[PDB]
């Protein structure tokens, strides 16, 4: 399938133990997709002060369209030193590894895989 319904745990930035997916744009997009497939991916909602507490490159989920079965359609965009790799809509948050942190909510998305 081109799209997968996922429910992503929403983490507080100060709880996150592993604050990025790796060291290159290509690695972070790769690892993000592996963790999404394995159910080991969390979501941090972007507000003032959040991104400087996480590791670059960043992997965003961005709205890809205007929401089947409650799931917003999203795709992955990476960012490194102010350059983005991909072009999409509004940021729903930044993806991070999930290693058992307690979430504050769940975000239902339809992920373009």
CATH number of the domain at 3-112, please?
2.30.30
Which experiment gave this structure?
X-ray
Domain boundaries, the chain: 3-112
Tell me the structure's resolution in angstroms, rounded to a single decimal.
1.7
- Tell me the residue length of the chain: 113
């Amino acid at each position: 399938k081109t799209h997968v319904q996922l429910s992503l745990p929403v983490l507080q930035v100060r709880d996150v133990l592993v604050r990025g997916f790796g060291d290159s744009v290509e690695e972070v997009l790769s690892e993000a997709r592996q963790h999404l497939k394995d159910g080991t991916c969390g979501l941090v909602e972007v507000e003032k002060g959040v991104l400087p507490q996480l590791e670059q490159p960043y992997v965003f989920i961005k709205r890809s369209d205007a929401a089947p079965h409650g799931h917003v359609m999203v795709e992955l965009v990476a960012e490194l030193e102010g350059i983005q790799y991909g072009r999409s809509g509004e940021t729903l948050g930044v993806l991070v590894p999930h290693v058992g942190e307690i979430p504050v909510a769940y975000r239902k998305v339809l992920l373009r895989k």
